[PDB]
Structure 1
Amino acid sequence: KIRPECFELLRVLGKGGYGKVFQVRKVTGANTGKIFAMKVLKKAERNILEEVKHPFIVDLIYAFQTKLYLILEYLSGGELFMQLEREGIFMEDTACFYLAEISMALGHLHQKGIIYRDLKPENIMLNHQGHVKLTDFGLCKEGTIEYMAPEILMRSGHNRAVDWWSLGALMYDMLTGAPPFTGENRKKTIDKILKCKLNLPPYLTQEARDLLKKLLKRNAASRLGAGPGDAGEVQAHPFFRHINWEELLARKVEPPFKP
């Protein structure tokens, strides 16, 4: 009832790992004239996206094969950090808004049993009105013990905590203009991530600095958000004290930038 020829290619939005994503116009049906995105590929993205339904996650509309086509809503707001590029750095209020929306989306995903694992600033799209939209999938997952390493007993690298670190790295980038650990090189970079000490600029509020320290904690078990409260642990932090979560979820909070 639906096929590749039901859509008109308008342009490539990008070529992410795996397949391409085109802007398309739907040429038949009742939604004729309507603009979507269409991802093309030669736990899986379709399943996850079928499942999840959040104000702050890109919606799925159609899916079908040849090889695989996913029709998603088209996001006009573009990349969030292209906004950071221009501002150089966000202020705590502005950063707070986006981090909060992103926190709700992660929290939802986590409840749905899914972790991002590789949430980066490219993944943060904005919709026509400037609200967050979480977007790419594919790199995403899900006797005695007295002598067993902690990382095993908690499924390190494989639990919700990995995403709260990322939210942390991303807060850091928003507030300072750069990620927390970076080197001249890829190796020198991962090595700073693994072992290096966090350096916070002195001009951060105490609330922001405290949150950053709790999110960017190497001990995954003690990291804010790692507990069963998940996003709740994070949203309760004083940094987010001026957030009305019901209004935020209603997208009735005004985004600080309107594309």
Structure 2
Amino acid sequence: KADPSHFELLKVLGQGSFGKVFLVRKVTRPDSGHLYAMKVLKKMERDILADVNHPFVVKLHYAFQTEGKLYLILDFLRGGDLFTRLSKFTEEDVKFYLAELALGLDHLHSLGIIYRDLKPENILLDEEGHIKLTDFGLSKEAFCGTVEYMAPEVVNRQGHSHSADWWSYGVLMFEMLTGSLPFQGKDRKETMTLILKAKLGMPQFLSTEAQSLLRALFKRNPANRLGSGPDGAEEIKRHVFYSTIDWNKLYRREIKPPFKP
């Protein structure tokens, strides 16, 4: 059991688009003195269920109803954002992060959760430097999102499935290996057209294997896109870009992250 009184505010961590986020101590048993991230909600940004157990998805520990509000207690993730940490660099360092991402993402998909706008701020590191996906339940509206990371079917307000998120996954991958985004204009609107129309040019400094994976991920038609079938990331995991990845050691957090916080 829990209520707001069970938790003492230490500091506000941020006040983003998808809510206000406090660091808290639990003072109640059994997890006395354990730090969490609290997030106060309810009373643009709607919600959907969450009880997710995955090494690369944020755990909801508690969630309770008090004064016509909804509090959510979650892993306190000390590592910060993935992108921040890189901005302080190998293809082998990225492949670790993309392997872990793929496993968690694929887990959200099997539960029916789909990001649409999956962006770098949704991917936090923990103390050890393993990734944790956040902010997957939500849903801004008046659907709004960050256009750079959106698949074509999504930009076009057509239907979408989990394939949308492997497009985004390619964008993240591309952004990591290059420091640039694959489609960007001066405007949200010019960016949208490049996503629909521009045939992406492969940077010729990427491995032949990374370019293989990016061409596979960047299919305007979801049905041609890698991961698009119902076994999802089974297709992706088998790609030669991840030859060096023992997917079972990875899930068990037995592979040393390349950067230590």
Q: TM bucket by the smaller chain?
A: 0.7 to 0.9
Q: Quote how far apart the aligned CAs of 1:156 are.
A: 5.2
Match of 2:127, SS state, is coil
Q: Quote how far apart the aligned CAs of 1:26 are.
A: 1.3
Deviations 1:149-174 (A, max 9, x none): xx7xxx95420100100100000000
Structure 2 CA distance for aligned equivalents of residues 109 and 58 of structure 1: 11
Structure 1 CA distance for aligned equivalents of residues 198 and 12 of structure 2: 39
Q: Quote how far apart the aligned CAs of 1:196 are.
A: 1.4
Match of 1:47, SS state, is coil
Runs of 4+ in 1 over 6 A off after TM superposition: none
- Write out aligned runs for 1:76-95 (5 A): 76-86=78-88, 90-95=89-94
Structure 2 CA distance for aligned equivalents of residues 18 and 100 of structure 1: 26
Letter in 2 for 1:34: H
Q: Which moved more, 1:244-253 or 1:17-26?
A: 17-26
Query: TM-score, normalized by length of structure 1?
Result: 0.88
Structure 1 CA distance for aligned equivalents of residues 32 and 244 of structure 2: 43
Unaligned regions of 5+ residues in structure 1, if any? Answer: 142-150
Residue of structure 1 equivalent to 2:101: 102
Letter in 1 for 2:36: F
Q: Quote how far apart the aligned CAs of 1:256 are.
A: 0.4
Unaligned regions of 5+ residues in structure 2, if any? Answer: 144-152
- Of all paired residues, the percent bearing the same amino acid is 56
Asked if the contact 1:58/1:73 (under 8 Å) is kept, the reply is yes
Residue of structure 2 equivalent to 1:164: 166
Match of 2:182, SS state, is coil
Deviations 1:180-239 (A, max 9, x none): 111112211122112112122111111100100110111111000101231001111000
Q: Does 1:209 align with 2:211?
A: yes
- Write out aligned runs for 1:107-256 (5 A): 107-137=106-136, 138-139=138-139, 157-256=159-258
Query: TM-score, normalized by length of structure 2?
Result: 0.87
Residue of structure 1 equivalent to 2:17: 17
Q: Which moved more, 1:67-76 or 1:194-203?
A: 194-203
Structure 2 CA distance for aligned equivalents of residues 84 and 192 of structure 1: 26
Q: Quote how far apart the aligned CAs of 1:29 are.
A: 2.2
Asked if the contact 1:46/1:70 (under 8 Å) is kept, the reply is no
Number of equivalenced pairs:
242
Residue of structure 1 equivalent to 2:53: 53
Q: Quote how far apart the aligned CAs of 1:246 are.
A: 0.5
Q: Which moved more, 1:211-220 or 1:18-27?
A: 18-27
Structure 1 CA distance for aligned equivalents of residues 174 and 11 of structure 2: 34
| Change beyond 3 A, Cα 1:6–1:46 | farther
Q: What's the Cα RMSD here?
A: 2.0
Asked if the contact 2:18/2:135 (under 8 Å) is kept, the reply is no
Match of 1:98, SS state, is helix
Structure 2 CA distance for aligned equivalents of residues 17 and 4 of structure 1: 23
Q: Which moved more, 1:189-198 or 1:93-102?
A: 189-198
Structure 1 CA distance for aligned equivalents of residues 233 and 87 of structure 2: 27
Match of 2:165, SS state, is helix
Asked if the contact 1:117/1:139 (under 8 Å) is kept, the reply is no
Asked if the contact 2:47/2:139 (under 8 Å) is kept, the reply is no
Q: Which moved more, 1:111-120 or 1:169-178?
A: 111-120
